[model samples]
Target: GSSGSSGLREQVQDLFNKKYGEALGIKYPVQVPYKRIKSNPGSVIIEGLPPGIPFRKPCTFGSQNLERILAVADKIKFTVTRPFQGLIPKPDESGPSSG
Candidate 1:
């Protein structure tokens, strides 16, 4: 049980790293960044995951790691949420034009 949005996010990141590290064979002490919403509550984002760790979709964790980390936050008693979006959009295809 954790209070405060930032605390929860940190806890989730720790759990993810610990569990995934062991299950995915990642070398311990991998750096994982836990992102947070600028003006939101109980909302979080996770990025900087290693290139080859199978997380969601086509990539999934095996049974051992899956149960602990993959389970929804509700089930795990944490209020952390993951909001995923691609990086900032690149310059428009059509080059800049006079206003």
Candidate 2:
């Protein structure tokens, strides 16, 4: 209503906000901003998105949330699998390092 000219652009923006909001499993006018993604090298890295936040502040997340988010992504036909990690567990207990 600010511009007052047809308002078509506003409607289109709202449409995308609704579309992606639903894809992110959320409602419009949301402010959480949990999921993030970046693509480089060999993988599409999602920061705040799910697959079990195994290392976030520790003790904050667990397999439970991971299963649930994967389930949600599954509803959208998006599947996350292993190999998202590079080096994996260190047999010597030195912590994981990149490959």
Candidate 3:
């Protein structure tokens, strides 16, 4: 469409938002904020969930979305690293551990 590079990058972000919603059990669409990597425009930095929202589920990327995103993600420097420090409470660990 417009710019192929930016277009793909934006699509990747949108797909991630969908995946995020699914992982977090969000029925309504949520816009997870992300910052663009200045040094590498192809990459992005997504802000993790707030401390109040204790991450109850294993919020991993779904295979379907993961594959779809990675299809174009591999063409660029795709990196989504965030601190889930507060997402899960310390001690009182719960939920099944997924490897």
Candidate 4:
């Protein structure tokens, strides 16, 4: 009984889309792609997230800030059995600074 790629991806999608965002009436939900643990997937790429508030646009995990992502990652990591691994961006480093 192994959790397939789509299985895990749907789980994450549910977390950001329905469980988290939709429940709160958020307009723009998140997008979770199908990936595998053994595939050595690289970073959690940011999608259509704009440089301003989280409105109608593409985004990752339905959240913006790094800490919140880290928090969700922590939960997802443990909740999903750690079979899926990837690089999560740190608060520091390089990127746009317009919050």
Candidate 5:
């Protein structure tokens, strides 16, 4: 299961490299991790990426570009995990959701 995530990450990275090579002017290989721990279960983490790359936090790409890359990834049958939540959500009046 872990390895499956790793494989998917690698594939996504490759797609990124191909799509952004010219615009980003990146010639060197980018480092990436196999899997990363998330606050929530089954969250996808894109780790070890180079600086200035798009779709990453604090420096994400434009919506158009992001959609293109995501489309390509989908075509390749990649599995992306759920969005990560750094910490557990607080309980509401209803009660704790996880419990």
Candidate 6:
């Protein structure tokens, strides 16, 4: 039910390796911490990411972006408990965008 500290951190850190970077003459095996944000669910904010983080990193994404995503998702929901039906059209082509 939860991705404890070790879970996603290990997964993200595994995407690169020092050996591969050494072969390419680059710095790699970027490191970062995985934090669970409850102040705003479906949100993540990072600060003080050390220079070692090499790729596009998560300083994070807040609710405004996710709300759009949910709007796109919410086009469908149970409208009736008595077994009724209705239409579920897709969101107009524009989709979720982020900071």
- Candidate 4 has its poorest 10 consecutive residues by lDDT at 73-82
- Per-residue alpha-carbon lDDT of model 2 for 1-99, expressed as tens digits? 122223433332233233333334433332212233222222222233445432121124344654443334323221133233332322222567687
List the lowest-lDDT window of 10 residues for candidate 1. 73-82
Per-residue CA lDDT of model 5 for 9-84, tens digit only, reads 4445555443332123334433322233223434333433333333342214544444454554423221244343
For model 4, how does the per-residue alpha-carbon lDDT over 33-86 read when each residue is reduced to its tens digit? Answer: 334422534423233332342322123424344334433432322113223233
lDDT of 6 by residue, 1-99 (tens): 122224333332332222222223334332222232333333322222333332222223234433332233323111111231333433334768895
Which stretch of 10 consecutive residues in model 3 shows the poorest summed lDDT?
A: 49-58
* Cα RMSD, model 1: 17.2
Q: What local distance difference test score does each model get?
A: 0.37, 0.32, 0.40, 0.34, 0.37, 0.29
Candidate 2, superposed: residue stretches over 4 Å from native: 1-6, 31-99
Residue 31, candidate 2: C-alpha displacement in angstroms: 7.8
Ranked by lDDT from best down, the candidates are 3, 1, 5, 4, 2, 6
- Higher-lDDT candidate of 2 and 5: 5
Question: Against the true structure, whose TM-score is highest?
Answer: 3
Q: How close is candidate 2 to the true structure, as a TM-score?
A: 0.25
Model 4: lDDT of residue 21: 27
- Candidate 3 residue lDDT tens string, 1-99: 122223544555565554444334444445554444434544443334333322211133444444444464322222345433234323222689677
What lDDT is reached at residue 34 by model 3?
A: 45
Model 6 stretches astray by more than 4 angstroms:
1-5, 22-55, 58-99
Q: For model 5, where is the 10-residue window of minimal lDDT? A: 18-27
Candidate 1 C-alpha lDDT tens digits along 6-99:
4433545556544433233344533333333334434433333334433332124444443444344223322234332333433223667687
